[PDB]
Amino acid sequence: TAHRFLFVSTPVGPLGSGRGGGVELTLPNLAKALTQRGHQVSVLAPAGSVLPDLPLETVPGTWQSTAQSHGRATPAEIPAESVLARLWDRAHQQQADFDLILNFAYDWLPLYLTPFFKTPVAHLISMGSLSEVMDQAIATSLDRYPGSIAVHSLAQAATFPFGDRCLCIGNALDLAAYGFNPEPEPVLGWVGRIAPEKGLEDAIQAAQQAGLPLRVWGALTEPDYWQRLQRAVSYQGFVSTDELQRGLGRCQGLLMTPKWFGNVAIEALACGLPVIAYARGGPLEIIEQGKSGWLVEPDQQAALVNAIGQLSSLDRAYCRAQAEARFSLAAMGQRLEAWLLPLLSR
Amino acid sequence: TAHRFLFVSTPVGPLGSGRGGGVELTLPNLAKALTQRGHQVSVLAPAGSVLPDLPLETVPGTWQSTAQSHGRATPAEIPAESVLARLWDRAHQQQADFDLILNFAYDWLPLYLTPFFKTPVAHLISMGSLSEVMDQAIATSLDRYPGSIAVHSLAQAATFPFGDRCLCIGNALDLAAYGFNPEPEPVLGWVGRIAPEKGLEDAIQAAQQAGLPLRVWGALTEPDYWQRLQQQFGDRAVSYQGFVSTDELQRGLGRCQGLLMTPKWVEAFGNVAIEALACGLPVIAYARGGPLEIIEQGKSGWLVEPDQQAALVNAIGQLSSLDRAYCRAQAEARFSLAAMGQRLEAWLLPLLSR
Numbered sequence: 001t002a003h004r005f006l007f008v009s010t011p012v013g014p015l016g017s018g019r020g021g022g023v024e025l026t027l028p029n030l031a032k033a034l035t036q037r038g039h040q041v042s043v044l045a046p047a048g049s050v051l052p053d054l055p056l057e058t059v060p061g062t063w064q065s066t067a068q069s070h071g072r073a074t075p076a077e078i079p080a081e082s083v084l085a086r087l088w089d090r091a092h093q094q095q096a097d098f099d100l101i102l103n104f105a106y107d108w109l110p111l112y113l114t115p116f117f118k119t120p121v122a123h124l125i126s127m128g129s130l131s132e133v134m135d136q137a138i139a140t141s142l143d144r145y146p147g148s149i150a151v152h153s154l155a156q157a158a159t160f161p162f163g164d165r166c167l168c169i170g171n172a173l174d175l176a177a178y179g180f181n182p183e184p185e186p187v188l189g190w191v192g193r194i195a196p197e198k199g200l201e202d203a204i205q206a207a208q209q210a211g212l213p214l215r216v217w218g219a220l221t222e223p224d225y226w227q228r229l230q231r232a233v234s235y236q237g238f239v240s241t242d243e244l245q246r247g248l249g250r251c252q253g254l255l256m257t258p259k260w261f262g263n264v265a266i267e268a269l270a271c272g273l274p275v276i277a278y279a280r281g282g283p284l285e286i287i288e289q290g291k292s293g294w295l296v297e298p299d300q301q302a303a304l305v306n307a308i309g310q311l312s313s314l315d316r317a318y319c320r321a322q323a324e325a326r327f328s329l330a331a332m333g334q335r336l337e338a339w340l341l342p343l344l345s346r
Numbered sequence: 347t348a349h350r351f352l353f354v355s356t357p358v359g360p361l362g363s364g365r366g367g368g369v370e371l372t373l374p375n376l377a378k379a380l381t382q383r384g385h386q387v388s389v390l391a392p393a394g395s396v397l398p399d400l401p402l403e404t405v406p407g408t409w410q411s412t413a414q415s416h417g418r419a420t421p422a423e424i425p426a427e428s429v430l431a432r433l434w435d436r437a438h439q440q441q442a443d444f445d446l447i448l449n450f451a452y453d454w455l456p457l458y459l460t461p462f463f464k465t466p467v468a469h470l471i472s473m474g475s476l477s478e479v480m481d482q483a484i485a486t487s488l489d490r491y492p493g494s495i496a497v498h499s500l501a502q503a504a505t506f507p508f509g510d511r512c513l514c515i516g517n518a519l520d521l522a523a524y525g526f527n528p529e530p531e532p533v534l535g536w537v538g539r540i541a542p543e544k545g546l547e548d549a550i551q552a553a554q555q556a557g558l559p560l561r562v563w564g565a566l567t568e569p570d571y572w573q574r575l576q577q578q579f580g581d582r583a584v585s586y587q588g589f590v591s592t593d594e595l596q597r598g599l600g601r602c603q604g605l606l607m608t609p610k611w612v613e614a615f616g617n618v619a620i621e622a623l624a625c626g627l628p629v630i631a632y633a634r635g636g637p638l639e640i641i642e643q644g645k646s647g648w649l650v651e652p653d654q655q656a657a658l659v660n661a662i663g664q665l666s667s668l669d670r671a672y673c674r675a676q677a678e679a680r681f682s683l684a685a686m687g688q689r690l691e692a693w694l695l696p697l698l699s700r
């Protein structure tokens with residue numbers, strides 16, 4: 001019995017714009033994870049979204065603000081011509097053409113709508129607790145529909161008082177499309193949305209360690225920013241994952257310095273690129289200290305320097321071995337089936 | 347054929363508190379207007395609500411911010427522990443116990459949720475255009491579910507582009523609570539919140555000049571304002587006659603020769619003109635918004651030029667031309683529960699499926 005799934009993406013931005021964060025990696029990988037087992041998976045996402053191979057349906061409208069831009073007492077916002085609202089209205093309309101509906105939005109409304117749907121609606125939470133309304137909505141969903149919530153990390157699960165009631169699936173990626181290369185060259189990678197404050201700001205600043213360039217990937221937003229330390233910093237634009245990975249794989253190490261998934265680490269490993277992260281949040285469950293990467297104290301600009309000088313120690317083939325050992329699609333396949341299948345009956 | 351209805355109140359505040367606004371009068375009245383015609387009506391409302399003779403279930407939560415205090419580009423807010431969201435969740439729980447659910451809340455969420463219900467949801471919009479997100483929600487609802495949206499006035503409909511596709515049910519009240527009084531005292535009425543920038547100094551000035559003392563009705567939050575009113579006018583000029591209730595209002599109001607109605611906002615539908623007619627009171631109102639379709643000019647009242655003393659003074663000196671018996675007959679004819687019942691049935695019975 002092959003089942004039919006509908007994935008409703010994040011409303012902060014179009015899939016494959018770079019603006020939807022880590023959902024743009026996880027959504028297609030978890031989709032591919034089920035299609036490989038003979039399931040049908042169809043995606044619904046904001047207008048402007050791109051997705052190879054997969055039945056996609058898009059809807060135009062106003063993007064949802066970022067959640068890490070609002071307090072804890074701040075309410076859920078539904079602006080005019082909300083894309084989120086129209087995404088869900090749309091899912092509701094076709095609910096009977098599907099066996100289950102998985103939501104990837106870190107948003108109140110999808111959770112709230114769960115009992116209003118006849119088709120079972122499972123939810124994959126992507127961030128820690130940020131809002132009171134959001135935690136209350138996840139909790140209400142659990143209470144009525146147990147097992148229907150999931151998470152990637154336990155450090156994510158632990159920010160919730162209902163934390164132990166959420167499943168863990170962790171995170172995967174399509175290993176086949178990442179080429180592991182030994183050829184390293186003194187470069188250094190960094191991969192994300194190049195925001196006003198993501199880790200430049202203040203992680204390039206620790207690229208001085210051996211005056212190393214820091215080749216920067218990521219979708220460039222429309223506004224400007226720019227020059228401190230006079231311009232040894234090799235740049236890149238957005239580009240597909242396959243162009244990313246060739247350009248990335250040939251780094252000596254990848255840096256991560258977010259404020260606190262973050263399933264970028266996991267891409268670097270798939271190329272045998274050792275990760276230097278802050279010993280904080282997600283990275284701790286991905287990186288194995290002084291083996292696949294370094295996990296240093298946050299906010300030093302000194303610890304990182306040292307970490308970057310110790311890269312040659314780490315076996316690059318080991319990084320690639322971990323990535324395969326844990327983070328395959330085939331394993332994430334089973335874990336999704338041991339999450340969703342039971343909800344088709346309960 | 348009788349049916350079962352579920353009425354879901356406003357999330358701005360409890361019923362029986364003053365915070366729910368005109369829903370505090372509309373909801374019971376429309377409810378009563380169906381029960382006195384065979385139907386059953388239940389009510390869902392926020393924690394604290396007081397509502398007699400009618401099955402009431404109350405719901406805990408944060409109240410919803412009044413829509414008029416937000417601008418047009420502002421989003422819809424759903425706060426943590428929202429009474430609004432919990433109301434509509436509870437309604438959906440019991441949806442199969444009723445033939446139709448009628449929403450009284452001026453908010454995005456109940457409108458968005460209409461296709462998500464198997465039981466028909468009808469919406470009584472209570473204010474004029476305020477937001478982009480609310481206007482589009484009603485618009486969407488109109489398209490998919492024509493005949494689903496009702497309004498109190500054409501003046502309020504006129505604020506929306508799609509106003510022509512809304513139904514005007516007007517308004518009603520329980521006439522038996524209001525005593526017709528054909529012989530009033532030499533006094534004038536004014537009803538509403540006692541604060542600055544609310545129309546009262548206009549009504550005091552025009553009353554005094556006319557040679558009649560004014561009697562007032564409503565909430566006084568700032569005593570310094572009241573003493574300041576006495577300072578610059580007269581101790582005789584204006585007289586507190588209590589808060590509003592409804593039985594105290596119809597007692598005290600019927601005794602006046604006229605209601606001076608001098609509001610600022612571009613409506614004030616505003617129940618009070620209807621209630622004044624119920625006691626056989628002629629209304630002297632500003633010629634704008636709701637009263638333009640309430641008062642028949644020169645027969646049940648006078649519609650006058652806004653913010654102008656001479657215009658009130660002239661209307662006051664023509665109150666005696668107006669038959670108080672007529673004021674009552676138009677309240678009986680246009681604003682009765684009996685009359686609202688057919689309109690509600692004209693509107694809601696076609697919306698029933700099965």
Ligand SMILES: C[C@H](O)[C@H](O)C1=Nc2c(nc(N)[nH]c2=O)NC1
Pocket residue numbers: 010011012020021022023064065066067068104105106107126127261
């Ligand atoms: C990966 C993560 O889900 C993504 O970066 C974000 N998603 C969301 C967000 N904010 C909201 N309101 N909703 C989301 O789904 N901010 C960031």
Ligand SMILES: C[C@H](O)[C@H](O)C1=Nc2c(nc(N)[nH]c2=O)NC1
Pocket residue numbers: 355356357358365366367368369410411412413414450451452453472473
């Ligand atoms: C009758 C009048 O419309 C009522 O007092 C109000 N209701 C509401 C309001 N604001 C919102 N958001 N919702 C309501 O139902 N402001 C005033």
